[PDB]
Write an enzyme that holds these catalytic residues in place. Structure first.
Site, PDB file in Angstrom:
ATOM      1  N   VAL A  26      -2.061  21.096  31.932  1.00 12.36           N
ATOM      2  CA  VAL A  26      -2.696  22.323  31.455  1.00 12.36           C
ATOM      3  C   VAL A  26      -1.812  23.056  30.452  1.00 12.36           C
ATOM      4  O   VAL A  26      -2.048  24.235  30.160  1.00 12.36           O
ATOM      5  CB  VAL A  26      -3.063  23.273  32.618  1.00 12.36           C
ATOM      6  CG1 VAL A  26      -4.103  22.652  33.554  1.00 12.36           C
ATOM      7  CG2 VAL A  26      -1.824  23.714  33.383  1.00 12.36           C
ATOM      8  N   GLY A  27      -0.799  22.392  29.915  1.00 13.87           N
ATOM      9  CA  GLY A  27       0.079  23.072  28.982  1.00 13.87           C
ATOM     10  C   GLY A  27       1.372  22.325  28.755  1.00 13.87           C
ATOM     11  O   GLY A  27       1.814  21.511  29.572  1.00 13.87           O
ATOM     12  N   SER A  28       2.001  22.636  27.621  1.00 12.96           N
ATOM     13  CA  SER A  28       3.165  21.900  27.144  1.00 12.96           C
ATOM     14  C   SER A  28       3.895  22.759  26.116  1.00 12.96           C
ATOM     15  O   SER A  28       3.377  23.779  25.655  1.00 12.96           O
ATOM     16  CB  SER A  28       2.746  20.547  26.553  1.00 12.96           C
ATOM     17  OG  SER A  28       3.846  19.665  26.445  1.00 12.96           O
ATOM     18  N   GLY A  29       5.108  22.338  25.764  1.00  7.59           N
ATOM     19  CA  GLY A  29       5.901  23.047  24.778  1.00  7.59           C
ATOM     20  C   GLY A  29       7.392  22.850  24.999  1.00  7.59           C
ATOM     21  O   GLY A  29       7.821  21.984  25.759  1.00  7.59           O
ATOM     22  N   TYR A  31       9.506  24.912  26.401  1.00  5.20           N
ATOM     23  CA  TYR A  31       9.977  25.377  27.702  1.00  5.20           C
ATOM     24  C   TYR A  31       9.725  24.371  28.821  1.00  5.20           C
ATOM     25  O   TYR A  31      10.385  24.446  29.866  1.00  5.20           O
ATOM     26  CB  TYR A  31       9.310  26.711  28.064  1.00  5.20           C
ATOM     27  N   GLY A  32       8.803  23.431  28.622  1.00  3.91           N
ATOM     28  CA  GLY A  32       8.418  22.490  29.655  1.00  3.91           C
ATOM     29  C   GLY A  32       6.914  22.315  29.718  1.00  3.91           C
ATOM     30  O   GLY A  32       6.173  23.045  29.048  1.00  3.91           O
ATOM     31  N   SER A  33       6.446  21.349  30.506  1.00  3.03           N
ATOM     32  CA  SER A  33       5.022  21.110  30.681  1.00  3.03           C
ATOM     33  C   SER A  33       4.585  21.526  32.078  1.00  3.03           C
ATOM     34  O   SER A  33       5.380  21.531  33.024  1.00  3.03           O
ATOM     35  CB  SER A  33       4.676  19.647  30.439  1.00  3.03           C
ATOM     36  OG  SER A  33       5.481  18.827  31.259  1.00  3.03           O
ATOM     37  N   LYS A  49       5.598  23.212  37.183  1.00  5.45           N
ATOM     38  CA  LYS A  49       6.245  23.206  35.872  1.00  5.45           C
ATOM     39  C   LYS A  49       7.426  22.244  35.885  1.00  5.45           C
ATOM     40  O   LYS A  49       8.359  22.416  36.677  1.00  5.45           O
ATOM     41  CB  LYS A  49       6.729  24.604  35.491  1.00  5.45           C
ATOM     42  CG  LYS A  49       7.397  24.626  34.104  1.00  5.45           C
ATOM     43  CD  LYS A  49       7.446  26.024  33.483  1.00  5.45           C
ATOM     44  CE  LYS A  49       8.524  26.890  34.129  1.00  5.45           C
ATOM     45  NZ  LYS A  49       8.796  28.146  33.362  1.00  5.45           N
ATOM     46  N   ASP A 164       5.981  35.377  34.269  1.00  5.32           N
ATOM     47  CA  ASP A 164       6.556  34.848  33.023  1.00  5.32           C
ATOM     48  C   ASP A 164       7.601  35.794  32.432  1.00  5.32           C
ATOM     49  O   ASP A 164       7.440  36.335  31.334  1.00  5.32           O
ATOM     50  CB  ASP A 164       5.466  34.566  31.975  1.00  5.32           C
ATOM     51  CG  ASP A 164       4.715  33.267  32.226  1.00  5.32           C
ATOM     52  OD1 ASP A 164       5.118  32.505  33.135  1.00  5.32           O
ATOM     53  OD2 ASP A 164       3.718  33.010  31.507  1.00  5.32           O
TER      54      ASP A 164
END
Lengths: 336, 7
Positions: A26-29, A31-33, A49, A164
């Protein structure tokens, strides 16, 4: 030690305990996935995460340690908490991956306004919970620094959690947007005021395009800095720039927010004060009459003190990594 | 307070 299983999802290897099932990316980048998953031990949906490159440099290794120290400390109903932290490593020598598990949060504050108009009761409850979480955070000398609607998770019961820890600019206090001085905890109070104004009106309060455009919008509402605030700005160029501005009086907020609950507008005036030493604190705002329906001074707890003395330590990559491993090993999960 | 809808 649980049984781990290994899989590749979106060309990322995930090696997690059996208790975490049906992982969906559901997300990535940088900072981590993140995967959503089902925690079979609690029966809840969770966010897992996987930290990206956690020990690639000194800077990364120390940032991993700081994040884990911070998340392990937070134990409050209105603040994101660490449900679990794990590594597949059996020892420090093979320790390379760190995984963090938190409650999966279905909607943020931007999402909830997309499908309903919040009542004034809804806004009282949401802002109350934000300030209740901030009182806890600030009592440990932690500053969030990046409060905005996308960092606030809300469920169907209108219950809220702050996520966050540190369009971002639109909720930023001007003294940190332009680096005027050392941050006060009340930079977070400025952000709450911006969020509350937006929830009351349906409009972003200071939607400037760059730093100067935004500063001019802020100063038109709250007035240009007076001599007492100017003395606290340490950058000489910043002081010279502010002194170049045409002076502007503070506006009457009641004439800007007509039709809003008058106690809401009164609280807004106390949060959006330009001098951060004069802004209301989270503890004081909880006692404001706007929250009379919700305020319970026996149910607004403070945190344990938080030791940040590690921040001034100068250590090797493998020393930050060993400290992180110790914190993974010493983690005690919350009660079910 | 009582209820909100999912997006």
């Amino acid at each position: 030690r649980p049984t781990f299983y290994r899989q590749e999802l979106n060309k990322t290897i995930w090696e997690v305990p059996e208790r975490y099932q049906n992982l969906s990316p559901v997300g990535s980048g940088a900072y981590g996935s993140v995967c959503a998953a089902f925690d079979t031990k609690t029966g809840h949906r969770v966010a897992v995460k996987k930290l990206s490159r956690p020990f690639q440099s000194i800077i990364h290794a120390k940032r991993t340690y700081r994040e884990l120290r911070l998340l392990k400390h937070m134990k409050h109903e209105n603040v994101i908490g660490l449900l679990d932290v794990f590594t597949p490593a059996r020892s420090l020598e093979e320790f390379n991956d760190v995984y963090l598990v938190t409650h999966l949060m279905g909607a943020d504050l931007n999402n909830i306004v997309k499908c309903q108009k919040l009542t004034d009761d809804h806004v009282q409850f949401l802002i109350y919970q934000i300030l209740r979480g901030l009182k806890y955070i600030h009592s440990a000398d932690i500053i969030h620094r990046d409060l905005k609607p996308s960092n606030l998770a809300v469920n169907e019961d209108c219950e809220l959690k702050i996520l966050d820890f540190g369009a971002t600019r639109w909720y930023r206090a001007p003294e940190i947007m332009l680096n005027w001085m050392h941050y006060n905890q009340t930079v977070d109070i400025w952000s709450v005021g911006c969020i509350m104004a937006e929830l009351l009106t349906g409009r972003t309060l200071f939607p400037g395009t760059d730093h100067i455009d935004q500063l001019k919008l802020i100063l038109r509402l709250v007035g240009t800095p007076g001599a007492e605030l100017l003395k606290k700005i340490s950058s000489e160029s910043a002081r010279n720039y502010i002194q170049s501005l045409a002076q502007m009086p503070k506006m009457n907020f009641a004439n800007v927010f007509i039709g809003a609950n008058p106690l809401a507008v009164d609280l807004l005036e106390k949060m959006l004060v330009l001098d951060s030493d004069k802004r209301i604190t989270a503890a004081q705002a909880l006692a404001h009459a706007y929250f009379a329906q919700y305020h319970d001074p026996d149910d607004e707890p403070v945190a344990d003190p938080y030791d940040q003395s590690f921040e001034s330590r100068d250590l090797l990559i493998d020393e930050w990594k060993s400290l992180t491993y110790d914190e993974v090993i010493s983690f005690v999960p919350p009660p079910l | 307070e009582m209820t909100l809808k999912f997006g």
